Amino acid sequence: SPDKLKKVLDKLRLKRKDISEAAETVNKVVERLLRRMQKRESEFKGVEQLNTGSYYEHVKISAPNEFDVMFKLEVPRIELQEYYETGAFYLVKFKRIPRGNPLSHFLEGEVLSATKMLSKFRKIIKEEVKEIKDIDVSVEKEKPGSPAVTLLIRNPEEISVDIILALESKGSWPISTKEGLPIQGWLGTKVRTNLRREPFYLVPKNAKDGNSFQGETWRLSFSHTEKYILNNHGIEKTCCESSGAKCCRKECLKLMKYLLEQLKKEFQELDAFCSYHVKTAIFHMWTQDPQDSQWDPRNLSSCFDKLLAFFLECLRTEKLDHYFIPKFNLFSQELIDRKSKEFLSKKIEYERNNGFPIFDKL
Ligand SMILES: [Zn+2]
């Protein structure tokens, strides 16, 4: 018979079925909205959905009726200024644009104001969504401190869709990423070169650090690159394809994400942890153990355990480098209290030694 891990994987997959019709309504609405926004004359006319993946391995931890989508907007001629030395935050300035900067009126001094740009973004979405007549779509009351523009869809049960604006820049990647994406021994040098020729994204995010520059800071996003890696994750090109062999790489990611999700429900001490920490850890593990034969499906329980051990060691050393931005320590004392990491370590060790009873629930 199958062990608990395989049962949990089966159950996780079957959950996709309960979310499918809502997911379809979401795509319907988003696509209508994008068309309306693309028809209209505004600084957001060029907006498009950035595809980041929708399966459990790709998305953040969420309620079954909560969705997130990123709307990307190409912004030519950005001059980036590192705001944090780690590369955690940036200010957005501009180089010379002889024909005129189309985002000119979103500037505050030399810097692009996320506050001004999001305010207009919110206003336009609210106006267009009012024109959707066949399905009840409104905009949730703005949550001070949250940049998402949240759609509420009622058909007739309520679905929430957080819309996140992402600036698209086609310039070379920021200097803070120079040693990031360490995939040379795994996906290799040509893939790394190709991936780094793609755009990078900037998403509005406030730092929690005083009044100066609030509403003017952005963090980098590589959601596109991350999707690509998740779906092209083998040293062999045929990994998980029909004329290749399956590996257990995504299964380990899913198990570890679900472990954290279930733990986060039980213990609000774990509020500062998110699925991105898990995805980051596993990117590092995929780099350390690049061979597809080091992720054989036969070895699921051993591979999951070596991922736990790795994550536990990141917790113990208080260090988990962003995979794209090596100086950005996601497990710094300032982002996550030492006592929270010690608490999570203790919970993980407990689960690992008792056959994962937290997976026994619904
Ligand atoms: Zn594979």
UniProtKB/Swiss-Prot annotation:
Catalytic activity: GTP + ATP = 2',3'-cGAMP + 2 diphosphate; GTP + ATP = pppGp(2'-5')A + diphosphate; pppGp(2'-5')A = 2',3'-cGAMP + diphosphate
Effect caused by changing S54A: Abolishes stimulation of interferon production
Domain of life: Eukaryota
Site residues, Arginine-anchor: R96
Alphabetical keyword list: Acetylation, ADP-ribosylation, Antiviral defense, ATP-binding, Cell membrane, Chromosome, Cytoplasm, DNA damage, DNA repair, DNA-binding, GTP-binding, Immunity, Innate immunity, Isopeptide bond, Lipid-binding, Lipoprotein, Magnesium, Membrane, Metal-binding, Methylation, Nucleotide-binding, Nucleotidyltransferase, Nucleus, Palmitate, Phosphoprotein, Transferase, Ubl conjugation, Zinc
Motif Nuclear export signal positions after renumbering to this chain: 9-14
Renumbered residue ranges of the record's region Interaction with collided ribosomes: 184-225
Post-translational modification PolyADP-ribosyl glutamic acid, affected residues: E31
Residue numbers of N6-acetyllysine PTMs: K227, K237, K257
Membrane-related topology note: Peripheral membrane protein
GO biological process: activation of innate immune response; cAMP-mediated signaling; cellular response to exogenous dsRNA; cGAS/STING signaling pathway; cGMP-mediated signaling; defense response to virus; determination of adult lifespan; DNA damage response
Post-translational modification (record): The N-terminal disordered part (1-146) is phosphorylated by AURKB during the G2-M transition, blocking CGAS liquid phase separation and preventing activation. Phosphorylation at Tyr-56 by BLK promotes cytosolic retention. Localizes into the nucleus following dephosphorylation at Tyr-56. Phosphorylation at Ser-275 activates the nucleotidyltransferase activity. Dephosphorylation at Ser-275 by PPP6C impairs its ability to bind GTP, thereby inactivating it. Ubiquitinated at Lys-257 via 'Lys-48'-linked polyubiquitin chains, leading to its SQSTM1-mediated autophagic degradation. Interaction with TRIM14 promotes recruitment of USP14, leading to deubiquitinate Lys-257 and stabilize CGAS. Ubiquitinated at Lys-227 by RNF185 via 'Lys-27'-linked polyubiquitination, promoting CGAS cyclic GMP-AMP synthase activity. Monoubiquitination at Lys-190 by TRIM56 promotes oligomerization and subsequent activation. Monoubiquitination by TRIM41 promotes CGAS activation.
Modified residues (Phosphoserine): S54, S146, S275
Residues carrying Phosphotyrosine: Y56
Residue numbers of N6-lactoyllysine PTMs: K11
Effect of R192E: Strongly reduced interaction with nucleosomes
Assembly and binders: Monomer in the absence of DNA. Homodimer in presence of dsDNA: forms a 2:2 dimer with two enzymes binding to two DNA molecules. Interacts with nucleosomes; interaction is mainly mediated via histones H2A and H2B and inactivates the nucleotidyltransferase activity by blocking DNA-binding and subsequent activation. Interacts with PQBP1 (via WW domain). Interacts with TRIM14; this interaction recruits USP14, leading to deubiquitinate and stabilize CGAS and promote type I interferon production. Interacts with ZCCHC3; promoting sensing of dsDNA by CGAS.
Biological function: Nucleotidyltransferase that catalyzes the formation of cyclic GMP-AMP (2',3'-cGAMP) from ATP and GTP and plays a key role in innate immunity. Catalysis involves both the formation of a 2',5' phosphodiester linkage at the GpA step and the formation of a 3',5' phosphodiester linkage at the ApG step, producing c[G(2',5')pA(3',5')p].
UniProt name for this protein: Cyclic GMP-AMP synthase
Source organism of this protein record: Mus musculus
Span covered, complete protein: 147 to 507 of 507
